[PDB]
């Protein structure tokens, strides 16, 4: 197989890593295991450490202007690399031993443990004139040659690389999520009744989602127009919750449902980037350097989790909006669902110009 490598500006430091992503196995995330190549001839300060952090760009502007680097550090950890501690001892992994056999004693392994309850690698859709770093949530591996962590790490004395966490659809599709309502009216002897449902629960990006809706409109009033909104419930916990939401898929129908009438129809909606390009602030998945990505995956919240992660939560919900002859009589019905990657197989050979 193949292995990725990154070099420090000074050439003193050559990190080898295997995979730029990690399987969140739900129960676990694949450990960040890699190796470092050091040159003791160039190294004079004899102390080498490598850092993994899950770090978040504090949102866009600071001092009301974009710039600086306000990394709001969700979690940081660093490992003593050279010399390896006489205390810290863990078994070597197959990948890393293969690398050493490629390299020898000059290279030194490291293993990072990713606890659960950690955000998936996501990034907020930058605005059209955002030439700074795309603000968001991602993990970072940085190597350096320093006496101590206190030391002001020289950028020359250091090398960096970014990594992304990913999730994949559970094999068992979820049961159909449905939602039904019955809105009474002061002017209507009998209430309006609404029912909405989806074809399945699990979904893949780029494939259409199909909603059925049934209506009983036996009131004195009509259902004038019906609006279909696939919406992105993105919640953030930078200091507290914030249910900042943006529609992604918007479909309109003038399907008139009169008083004393029935209705039932199927619709299809398809999220994608292009239509929502101009909606600054949308959430997408992992972001490597500058590349085009896909729309944010259906972030999984663990059932056993306490829902207190100071990260980013991405969930997806469809809403049907019935307009009535004219009071806030118009009624919206909400239906959650999952929209996220199919089963994983390989790396992201993202397409771009040479």
């Amino acid at each position: 197989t193949r292995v990725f490598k990154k070099a420090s500006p000074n050439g003193k430091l050559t990190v080898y890593l295997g995979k730029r992503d990690f399987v969140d196995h739900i129960d676990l995330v694949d450990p960040v295991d890699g190796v470092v190549l050091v040159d003791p001839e160039y190294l004079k300060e004899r102390r080498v450490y490598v850092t993994l952090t899950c770090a978040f760009r504090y949102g866009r502007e600071d001092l009301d202007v974009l710039g600086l680097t306000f990394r709001k550090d969700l979690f940081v950890a660093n490992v003593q690399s050279f010399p390896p501690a006489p205390e810290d001892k863990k078994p070597l992994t197959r990948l890393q031993e293969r690398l050493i056999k490629k390299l020898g004693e000059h290279a030194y392994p490291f293993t990072f443990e990713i606890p659960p309850n950690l955000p998936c690698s996501v990034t907020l859709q930058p605005g059209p004139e955002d030439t700074g770093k795309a603000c968001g949530v991602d993990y970072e591996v940085k190597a350096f040659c320093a006496e101590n962590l206190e030391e002001k790490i020289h950028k020359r004395n250091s090398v960096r690389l970014v990594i992304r966490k990913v999730q994949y659809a559970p094999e068992r599709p979820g049961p159909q999520p449905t939602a039904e309502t019955t809105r009474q009216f002061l002017m209507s002897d009998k209430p309006l009744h609404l029912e909405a449902s989806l074809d399945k629960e699990i979904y893949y990006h780029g494939e259409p989602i199909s909603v059925n809706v049934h209506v009983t409109n036996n009131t004195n009033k009509t259902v004038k127009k019906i609006k279909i909104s696939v919406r992105q419930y993105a919640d953030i916990c930078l200091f507290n919750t914030a249910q900042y939401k943006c529609p992604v898929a918007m479909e309109e129908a003038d399907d008139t449902v009169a008083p004393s009438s029935t209705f039932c129809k199927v619709y299809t909606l398809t999220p994608f980037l292009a239509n929502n390009r101009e909606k600054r602030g949308l959430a997408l998945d992992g972001k490597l350097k500058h590349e085009d990505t896909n729309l944010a995956s259906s972030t999984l919240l663990r059932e056993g989790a306490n829902r207190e992660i100071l990260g980013i939560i991405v969930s997806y919900k469809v809403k049907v909006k019935l307009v009535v002859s004219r009071a806030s009589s118009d009624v919206a019905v909400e239906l959650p669902f999952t929209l996220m990657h199919p089963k994983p197989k390989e790396e992201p050979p993202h397409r771009e110009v040479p």
Partner: single-chain antibody
Amino acid sequence: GDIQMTQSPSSLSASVGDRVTITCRASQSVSSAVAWYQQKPGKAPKLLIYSASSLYSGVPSRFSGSRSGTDFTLTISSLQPEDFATYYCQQYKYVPVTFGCGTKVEIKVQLVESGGGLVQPGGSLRLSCAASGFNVYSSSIHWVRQAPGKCLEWVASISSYYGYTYYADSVKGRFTISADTSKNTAYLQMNSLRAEDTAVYYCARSRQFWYSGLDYWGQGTLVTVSS
């Protein structure tokens, strides 16, 4: 700039039920963004292997691939009597993705193209690609020309999920691509036509959300230009 995928085993034959090898030489570092296909005399060229390693669904295991540096090898341990074809090597790390000429070896889901024919030089025409069983919003669409007696060349591409259109230099601002997502169709308009345009063009599925090899394509349509 432009990438070349040369082929050493250009002409082989007289080989029955044996292990034979196929070497594609990459004009540049391409990592694993390389795929190999096979094509009969004038049929739909089907996928064989992508990323040089992952053999496709259903394809017999007698087909295998390997990569050494920028050099690429195909093995058939034993040539099954139907395997005789032209086998195409193609890098797909850079736009334009490029196909090299393949290997003649011999012995002594719905997708369809449409809208071709003959056109006078300097004319214009519309080419159609009906697709069925899948979705444009999950699958990229690609038109590729096959000049008879010349290698394959990607010419047109739509990322409907991103709404991006790629073309090659010989069709910059000259041939236009579009896709009726409602009708699940690809349309390509040809302007100011010349001799090079006379070839059989194919439309081909990708798997847009997560790119892989070109799996199932059309039957190809001829576009002829003559004075």
